[PDB]
C-alpha cells in the first residue's frame, strides 16, 4: 500500500 | 517514422526499451524528501522529488512539497509534476499553485481507484461549499464545470485570504485513465491535451502547469512526454529528428520514474505519432480528433 510499484 | 513504430512492435521489444530507459535513467539524491519530518508529506516511500528540481514552499515552517519542476530548455516549456495531495498537504498543494502563479491543474487519477483513495478531495465539489485551508490561508471556490464522457473541465477561483487577491485556476480532470493503464485511445488522449493547450494554461505567460496523478510519475509522465515531443516537432526543422527515448531520459533528470509501464511508454509513441498528424497537417479536414473523441 505504501509503495507505488509492486 | 511510423513504420519504425511497427518494427519495434513486431519484435514486441518494448519491455526491452523500457528497461533500458529504467537503467539509463538519472539517479539524483532526494535528501530533503527522506528527512523524518517529511515522512507524512509523501504518499509513497519510493516516489520522491530530487533535491535539485524539487519545488519549495515560501512558507517558513517547512518548505517540502513532493513536487518537481520539470523544465525543458529546448522545447521552452515547464511543468510541475507532483503527487496527489494528502489530507494534510492540500493547503501545501494550493500554496504551491499560488506561489508558482500556475494557471492550470491537470488531474490524471480519480480520488478513489480500485477501492482505495489515491488522492485527496482537494477541490470543492459544490459551488455552495467553498473550501478554506487554514494552515496556508487560502480559500477555494468552485465556479463552473463542464463534464464530458471521460473528462471534466472545472473552473476554480482560488483566493488568498492574506492579500485578498483572487485567481482563476483551470482544472482538467481525466476521469477514465487508470493507474498503470492507458487512455481508451490516442484520439481520446490527444483531445484532452489539446483542450489544455487552448486554455492557455500551458503558455509561458503564466507559471508552470501543475500535472499530477496518484504519484505523478506514470500517467503524468506520459502526458508531458507526449506534450513535449509534439512541442519539439513544430520547432526543430526536422520533426523526424525527435527521439522519444531521448526526451523521456531528459525528463527523468527532473523527476524519477516518469512513465510507469512499457505499455504507457508504447502509448506515448502512438500519441505523438497520431498527434504528429495535426502538427504535420492532418489531411484537408482537421478537427477530426474532436469528432472521434466521443466526448459526450
Author numbering:
A (entry chain E): 1160 to 1165
B (entry chain A): 3 to 298
Which of the paper's sentences describe this entry?
Protein Tyrosine Phosphatase 1B (PTP1B) is the prototypical protein tyrosine phosphatase and plays an essential role in the regulation of several kinase-driven signalling pathways. Here we identify PTP1B as an inhibitor of IL-6 and show that, in vitro, it can dephosphorylate all four members of the JAK family. Dephosphorylation of substrate is initiated by nucleophilic attack by the active-site cysteine (Cys215) to form a phosphoenzyme intermediate followed by hydrolysis of the cysteinyl-phosphate to release free phosphate. Asp181 acts as both a proton donor, enabling protonation of the tyrosyl leaving group, and as a proton acceptor, receiving a proton from the water molecule that hydrolyzes the phosphoenzyme intermediate.
Although our structural and biochemical data show that PTP1B exhibits a preference for dephosphorylation of the second pTyr of JAK2, it is clear that both pTyr residues can be dephosphorylated. In order to observe the first pTyr in the active site, we solved structures of PTP1B (D181A/Q262A/C215A) bound to a substrate peptide in which only the first or second tyrosine was phosphorylated (ie. pYY or YpY) to 2.34 and 3.09 Å resolution respectively. These structures confirmed that either phosphotyrosine can occupy the catalytic pocket. Three copies of the PTP1B:YpY peptide complex are present in the asymmetric unit, however one was not fully resolvable.
